[model samples]
Target chain A: PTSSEQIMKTGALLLQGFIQDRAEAPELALDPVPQDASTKKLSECLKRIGDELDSNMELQRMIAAVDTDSPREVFFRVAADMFSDGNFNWGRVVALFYFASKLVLKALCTKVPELIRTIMGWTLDFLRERLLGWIQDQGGWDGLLSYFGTGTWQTVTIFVAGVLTASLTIWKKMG
Target chain B: PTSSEQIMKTGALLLQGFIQDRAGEAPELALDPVPQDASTKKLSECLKRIGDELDSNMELQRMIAAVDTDSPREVFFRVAADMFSDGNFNWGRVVALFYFASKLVLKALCTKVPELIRTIMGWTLDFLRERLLGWIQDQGGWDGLLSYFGTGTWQTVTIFVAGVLTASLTIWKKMG
Candidate 1:
């Protein structure tokens, strides 16, 4: 197995850049100014951005091309970008988790506890706010989760939410 | 919202039914050596006592039967979590059920666990399955799959069982 130091950093920067760009990009101008309309459009744009990341040539190349020797940093960085999209489409969130799971498992098997902690921690940090934002931005409890929440989707959401929680517990325990 | 003791006890029994039902389906399957392990033996003994008490406990059965079929996911988790929160429940039994029942149910339903395990352990469900299943295969077979209650802790089992059972029921309903 070859070391993936060089390629790993490249992947990290690409994802980091994308996330920063989304924030730096100005909000789209709107007319009529329906209260929730801009939110709906931005949500749509976020989904498109998520799809673009999925098709991102650089990311696609790096994820597939990187070896096991790739730094855990690469995965942490990729995860940072995963939740940057406000829409947080189920498919994309699951895919990001699937990818994060791979590296987390790899970190576990290798006995890299620090690496495991960092990777899992990053996932929650990236996910929690996005999930809360969705719940909040939509309205309140009866707000909007129902529209996007289905059984399979709920399974994944609850599962991920549980994992983030469980990891934090473990981290706290260890500390 | 309901006082959790009765709900949890009933939920545990119903979960036990899932395990027993699966075991009854395959007569030739041998009980895993786990039942013989000291910790597992203790669990077996404890659950059996509970089983026997409930055998004569008609009031409990009526309560369990009365649980609405709404299948409210929130209520289920709340009940399960409350049951497991005390740390009085057996982790050994809970994990054992995870290994044994998870594999058998997945097999019977034609689902892959490594796929669904993302919801459980965050890694390969098959990894745990292979390790435990090998022991059972090499030893005898499964006892059955049953889930019980507890909070924070029981949440995993609570959610997993709810999702899988609901999906299976839905699919079965569609076919029927």
Candidate 2:
């Protein structure tokens, strides 16, 4: 019988394989293709960096040195130190995060299940809704509005009004 | 046509049918909801096309049809996982993951709020049809879509599924 622990380890490794595949092949990885060649080039370049970040302990420590609070700085330092390209592409910056994301997840899956569960809470907040934001901004609204309807905005308004009225009534009663 | 692809194709088709049946019975949405949508209908048609692909690959279909388990789904996950582990990950493995995860979520939701699954599917399928299929066709048509599974560049698919999963979870939360 496969122990629960073995199942989880394989699950994480399978995920790692999936992420590794994605990081390596951005052209095949992204949908709608990159908007421009610069984006495409940067995508491939980032995958290479991600490949190294997987196993290189020294590189990981070096990135950690950049202020832990603002990780964007870490990426900037990574690009400056690792790849000496003339102009900065934000795609590369995003890739650094993408790489970091898989690295962290792998670690959490193997050794930090508690942290992984805590982080899972943020997944719904970050990945799904924000994931749609891109398409919604890019003319997906035409279909989105047709399906979601304008009525949701009204729900928000009503909820806010109810909250405000309740607060005011409570304050007056207290006074 | 190989039965291998047929099995996968049937997996999607059957799942779509299950979703539609669930959507119809769901109380949260009004009757006859999603199959009426042009996008949903087209998606079903596409699934059928993928199913038809199995005919040309005789060996594939034979292996699938001959799967020991009575439940096709059981066979699906088993074979899909095995294929994924077989050294070269491709579009087939990606399809396996997508189908497996999506069905798992759908089944879990249906267990609680049978109707909620329809509502979530409506938005998710709509997005997949318009945004996803549109770009995918531009890149390589239907064949391109299948090849994508192997290419393993499916971060977008994950994002889309995440949105669907989020909708399902949120609705589940509000139901209680």
Candidate 3:
């Protein structure tokens, strides 16, 4: 059973991985994203979420509408809109991180690559300020599995398989 | 707003496309055992379960034993084609078809009849292309997939994202 803290940590790592992979080459003096046991465990989930965010047109448009001058402002503005309804569930939190990842990626792409650290800082800040309490309130990451109608990790895996097979068949044709 | 019927039709068409693309690909048929990683282990278990269920099917077994003039792969195509013969396509049925196809792959591996896979793949491609593609065009193309699976809501979008993520891993495991 993954705790909310673990989920949040994994989410941050996922975002970090995404940014580092996509950020400009020369400025990436940072160390490589860790591939330790814990990180490897969540790598698939992270990769899938990243791919989903990349393919999302809505997020692309949302990020496109924002000014890229200040990565922190962009992060706050996008995070604000994403959570505007104030219904902070596990899904939304994951989505927010994916959104932030895209923001960072876009910033990197648009030549403001130096803002990578600042963007990641704002994301972590938002997570602490807006999401952690709600996560603890909902009984941690178990709440996420329950929300998706899964009880065990195995169930989540099977459910993800079913959904993955269906979505791929459908989305492939769409593409 | 798309009707339920439209959704079903689009689902069938999408399944058709999935089968055609996967089955028609020569590279996809390579029988290399997928590396066992934490991510792939669960998927491997899922596929094994699918194989087990398929192995226990009495009717399918009977059909396999009854094969004489036709190959086991041909018998599989006949059974799968009959599943959709009623022209009533739903999400459940579509998923079952996918599982059924996967089970055949397992059966082929077990029986040491790997070439049966190519036959099965070709048959699926031909059946879906001939039968479902035209109806899909009549139902307004693959765009209905987006309309049916998701909408403009945050919750729906999240679900869609989850679905995409889940579906992707299944394919990865299958092909890996």
Best by lDDT: 3
Q: How do the residues A48-86 of candidate 2 rate in per-residue lDDT, one tens digit apiece?
A: 444544444543443334333333333333334322443
Give me the candidate number with maximum TM-score: 3
- For candidate 3, the TM-score is 0.37
Model 1 CA lDDT for position B75: 30
Expressed as tens digits, the lDDT of each residue in A65-124 for candidate 3 is 555665554456556655667776555665566656766777777777546555665676
Better of 1 and 3 by lDDT: 3
* Candidate 3 per-residue lDDT over residues B1-176, each given as its tens digit: 34445444434433333333333224665544323444334433433333344444343444334333224554445555655565544222333445455445545555676676666655655664666555445545434222222112222122212222223333333443
Ten-residue stretch with the least lDDT total in model 2 chain A: A26-35
Backbone clash pairs for candidate 3 read A164-B166, A164-B167, A165-B167
1 or 3, which is superior by DockQ?
3
User: Candidate 2 falls in which docking quality class?
Assistant: incorrect
- The CAPRI category of model 3 is incorrect
Interface RMSD of 1: 22.6
Runs with alpha carbons beyond 4 Å of true place in candidate 3: A1-8, A21-28, A32-41, A138-175, B1-176
Candidate 2 vs candidate 3: the TM-score winner is: 3
lDDT of 1 by residue, A130-162 (tens): 454553443432332233443444344444444
Report lDDT (CA) for all predictions: 0.36, 0.35, 0.48
Score candidate 1 by DockQ.
Answer: 0.01
Where is model 1 more than 4 Å wrong at Cα? A1-55, A64-77, A80-98, A101-136, A139-175, B1-36, B39-160, B171-176
**Fraction of true A-B contacts recovered by candidate 2:** 0.02
